């Protein structure tokens, strides 16, 4: 995204110990009166969990 105040293109980084995959990204304009800027985004991450030593059964 880009903030005019900083004149810089910034990004929100993902911070985790393990990778995932983005399953769905949903754009939320709802409850808005105008909101033309598309300010809310929902990103769902898929983290696979393979059976592993220490996982409970």
């Amino acid at each position: 995204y880009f903030d005019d105040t900083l004149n810089k293109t910034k990004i929100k980084t993902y911070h985790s110990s393990e990778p995932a995959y983005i399953e769905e990204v949903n754009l939320i304009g709802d409850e808005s009166n105008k909101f033309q800027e598309l300010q809310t985004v929902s990103i769902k991450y898929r983290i696979r969990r393979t059976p592993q030593i220490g996982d409970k059964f």
Partner: protein, 45 residues
């Protein structure tokens, strides 16, 4: 053409930084980001 699907009308569309975040065929305010033909490698395990 980037794509955005209406969560409630199924209508494909391609919003721009210059248009309202709304389903142009229904009027919904929720849009699913469409998947594209994008290469991804996978380890088969």
């Amino acid at each position: 053409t980037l794509k955005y699907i209406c969560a409630e009308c199924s209508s494909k569309l391609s919003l721009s930084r210059t248009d309202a975040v709304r389903c142009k065929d229904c009027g919904h305010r929720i849009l699913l980001k469409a998947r594209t033909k994008r290469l991804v490698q996978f380890e088969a395990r």
